[PDB]
Design an enzyme around this catalytic site. Structure first.
Site, mmCIF file in Angstrom:
data_model
loop_
_atom_site.group_PDB
_atom_site.id
_atom_site.type_symbol
_atom_site.label_atom_id
_atom_site.label_comp_id
_atom_site.label_asym_id
_atom_site.label_seq_id
_atom_site.Cartn_x
_atom_site.Cartn_y
_atom_site.Cartn_z
ATOM 1 C CG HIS A 159 -22.067 -13.554 -1.803
ATOM 2 N ND1 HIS A 159 -21.928 -13.208 -0.476
ATOM 3 C CD2 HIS A 159 -21.100 -12.881 -2.470
ATOM 4 C CE1 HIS A 159 -20.915 -12.371 -0.345
ATOM 5 N NE2 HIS A 159 -20.394 -12.159 -1.540
ATOM 6 N N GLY A 165 -14.434 -7.563 -2.686
ATOM 7 C CA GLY A 165 -13.523 -8.629 -2.333
ATOM 8 C C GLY A 165 -13.273 -8.785 -0.849
ATOM 9 C CB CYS A 186 -17.550 -10.954 1.143
ATOM 10 S SG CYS A 186 -18.746 -9.651 0.787
HETATM 11 C C1 LIG Z 1 -18.129 -8.911 -0.736
HETATM 12 O O1 LIG Z 1 -18.411 -9.790 -1.803
HETATM 13 C C2 LIG Z 1 -18.902 -7.619 -1.005
HETATM 14 C C3 LIG Z 1 -18.459 -6.512 -0.029
HETATM 15 C C4 LIG Z 1 -19.196 -5.152 -0.362
HETATM 16 C C5 LIG Z 1 -18.855 -4.686 -1.745
HETATM 17 C C6 LIG Z 1 -18.661 -3.139 -1.651
HETATM 18 N N1 LIG Z 1 -18.500 -2.844 -0.144
HETATM 19 C C7 LIG Z 1 -18.811 -4.085 0.617
HETATM 20 O O2 LIG Z 1 -18.779 -4.189 1.800
HETATM 21 N N2 LIG Z 1 -20.330 -7.870 -0.854
HETATM 22 C C8 LIG Z 1 -21.266 -7.631 -1.972
HETATM 23 O O3 LIG Z 1 -20.873 -7.220 -3.019
HETATM 24 C C9 LIG Z 1 -22.759 -7.908 -1.749
HETATM 25 C C10 LIG Z 1 -23.164 -9.269 -2.345
HETATM 26 C C11 LIG Z 1 -24.669 -9.581 -2.062
HETATM 27 C C12 LIG Z 1 -25.103 -10.842 -2.854
HETATM 28 C C13 LIG Z 1 -24.898 -9.875 -0.558
HETATM 29 N N3 LIG Z 1 -23.531 -6.837 -2.356
HETATM 30 C C14 LIG Z 1 -23.343 -5.459 -1.865
HETATM 31 O O4 LIG Z 1 -22.585 -5.236 -0.976
HETATM 32 O O5 LIG Z 1 -24.086 -4.402 -2.447
HETATM 33 C C15 LIG Z 1 -23.453 -3.130 -2.424
HETATM 34 C C16 LIG Z 1 -24.527 -2.051 -2.115
HETATM 35 C C17 LIG Z 1 -24.450 -0.833 -2.991
HETATM 36 C C18 LIG Z 1 -25.624 -1.829 -3.210
HETATM 37 C C19 LIG Z 1 -27.133 -1.839 -2.921
HETATM 38 C C20 LIG Z 1 -27.536 -0.385 -2.608
HETATM 39 C C21 LIG Z 1 -29.037 -0.067 -2.790
HETATM 40 C C22 LIG Z 1 -29.577 -0.568 -4.134
HETATM 41 C C23 LIG Z 1 -29.359 -2.080 -4.205
HETATM 42 C C24 LIG Z 1 -27.854 -2.423 -4.144
#
Ligand SMILES: *[C@@H](O)[C@H](C[C@@H]1CCNC1=O)NC(=O)[C@H](CC(C)C)NC(=O)OC[C@H]1C[C@@H]1C1CCCCC1
Ligand SMILES: *[C@@H](O)[C@H](C[C@@H]1CCNC1=O)NC(=O)[C@H](CC(C)C)NC(=O)OC[C@H]1C[C@@H]1C1CCCCC1
Lengths: 303, 303
Positions: free
Chosen positions: A43, A145, A147
């Site tokens: 992603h 950040g 990931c």
């Molecule tokens: C790295 O890019 C990042 C790490 C996350 C961000 C906050 N804490 C972490 O470990 N990964 C992401 O942002 C992913 C990206 C997708 C495309 C795989 N998204 C993500 O982590 O979503 C955060 C969850 C709160 C969101 C969901 C909760 C329920 C409703 C839908 C969204």
């Protein structure tokens, strides 16, 4: 009395020298540089307005080699090839990492512990250890950040990479990918609501912890009564416990203490209904974040 | 719901490159190699039949430069000078460590966390983080041969060395030396029974933890009632709690959540008498192993 048990992570130096930064102009995250290959979550190709339902096949074909910027922050690595393997990218770079350790890729199973190196902008910021939960989440500490941060174990001098962080769930836990590209459990690398499987006590780890108490002089729970492995697993299904499977590490704990596995399975059944006001290693609830191997190594000095 | 809090250690790579092995023909333990200096516990000079009541002054004068063997296991460093500073040796070696990081020596105070690199035969084997207990012990994981393992914090790129491991107490906890040579608390580096001071809850860390619960949507304990800092400290003396002293890190948590410090001091007083069957971040007892800085960094992303 102190149990002598701590959340013990591997020394991170070997893996620190493999971390890089990877960006496509939208997301910045971390990559793992081994030989001429850089692994990172896919992603990174995803624009900010497409994280919930991206078409990764169309995004990949829309990218070229110089679409990916790879930077060492503790240099620039020119990308000469790019490929997608499940939920990960496999970038080929012109220079090989001179600090590549001996490594393998391995999937980690529920109840097993591994060490994680949390990185941001390719800069390692902290290390911790987690156990893969039965529902294929981890109770980690990740922010935006993070990931590309990697999880691994170490057999001798060989680093067994087992986890690359991808996302956080609604309940606060985290999940990611193995280096074969698959996500753990039934999760998808899409920023949408997803079904979450139930969590369970890792019975084998609970047994390891009760053995740690005995090894520290704490054994009020040990009664001569026994529960068989077969009868416990039947009980476990109806009480949100994992099914127990003994190992050589557990048998070593049974020999050292002189307390059979079946005695502790009976204890777990009784302690699950309540501690009756007593404590075990300064705790009033069952603990399952320490493995049999953790107890053997930290308390018995056996690896 | 997961709090997002883990026992977070610094990446150990910088300190791994400073570890060596030190032996005098009786004990083998670890040393810290910075510039042309190698620090190690002084009981390395102590024969196996003298660990309970050694005369370190007579032992030091009985040693010469080549009495000390210093080995890098991940080379041989010729010792050209030796000195004793309190409970530590200050060995001067002919070659300077080319990987010496920017460093300072600093003493760590009760309630503050630091990262430890556990080593054996100069080989780093695991890292973990601990908080200095009010009685100047740590609840670490150390076995025979672990002495010389170091504890440190990191401000920017500067490593602040604060701990060199010396011994284990009868109750299972551990203590050691600062790099000015003094032992923490009233402990002596002699293998004999020693008085142990009482342990206490670190009130400031308990407040940080209650703030972490609020930051995760957990606030059933927060009542509008308040306890003043003055009245709480008077209460703390009679209940085996440390006296609270606010900091900027705590004030930042008060601003983010909108909950004043005094509200949580009242909560601590009520929760100490019992949780009434409820849980906070999946716990039924007060937690004090997370600092205000841990909460700011891991949950708010603020360092
Ligand atoms: C790295 O890019 C990042 C790490 C996350 C961000 C906050 N804490 C972490 O470990 N990964 C992401 O942002 C992913 C990206 C997708 C495309 C795989 N998204 C993500 O982590 O979503 C955060 C969850 C709160 C969101 C969901 C909760 C329920 C409703 C839908 C969204
Ligand atoms: C490093 O040499 C080693 C590390 C210890 C060993 C086991 N776990 C550790 O952290 N340090 C020692 O062996 C010290 C050496 C003295 C000279 C400072 N001794 C020690 O740690 O004693 C172990 C405690 C069990 C002993 C005491 C309990 C109460 C009765 C008196 C002895």
């Amino acid at each position: 009395h102190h149990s002598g048990l701590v959340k013990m992570s591997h020394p991170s130096g070997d893996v620190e020298a493999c971390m890089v930064q990877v960006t496509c102009g939208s997301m910045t995250l971390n990559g793992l540089w081994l030989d001429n290959t850089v692994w990172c979550p896919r992603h990174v190709m995803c624009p900010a307005d497409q994280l919930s339902d991206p078409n990764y096949d169309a995004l990949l074909i829309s990218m070229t080699n110089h679409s990916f910027s790879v930077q060492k922050h503790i240099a620039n690595l020119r990308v000469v090839g790019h490929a997608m393997q499940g939920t990960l990218l496999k970038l080929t770079v012109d220079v090989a990492n001179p600090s590549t350790p001996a490594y393998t890729f391995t999937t980690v199973k529920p109840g097993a512990a591994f060490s994680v190196l949390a990185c941001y902008n390719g800069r390692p910021t902290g290390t911790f250890t987690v156990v893969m939960r039965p529902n294929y989440t981890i109770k980690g500490s990740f922010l935006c950040g993070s990931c590309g941060s990697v999880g691994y174990t170490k057999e001798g001098s060989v680093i067994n990479f087992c986890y690359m962080h991808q996302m956080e769930l609604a309940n606060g836990t985290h999940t990611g990918s193995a280096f074969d590209g698959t996500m753990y459990g039934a999760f998808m690398d899409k920023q949408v609501h997803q079904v979450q499987l139930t969590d369970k006590y890792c019975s084998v780890n609970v047994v390891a912890w009760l053995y740690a108490a005995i090894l520290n002089g704490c054994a009020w729970f040990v009664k001569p009564n026994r529960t068989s492995v077969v009868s416990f697993n039947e009980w476990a299904l109806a009480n949100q416990f994992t099914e127990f499977v003994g190992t050589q590490s557990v048998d070593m704990l049974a020999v050292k203490t002189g307390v059979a596995i079946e005695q502790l399975l009976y204890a777990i059944q009784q302690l699950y209904t309540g501690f009756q006001g007593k404590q075990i290693l300064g705790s009033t609830m069952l603990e399952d974040e320490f493995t049999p191997e953790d107890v053997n190594m930290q308390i018995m000095g056996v690896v």
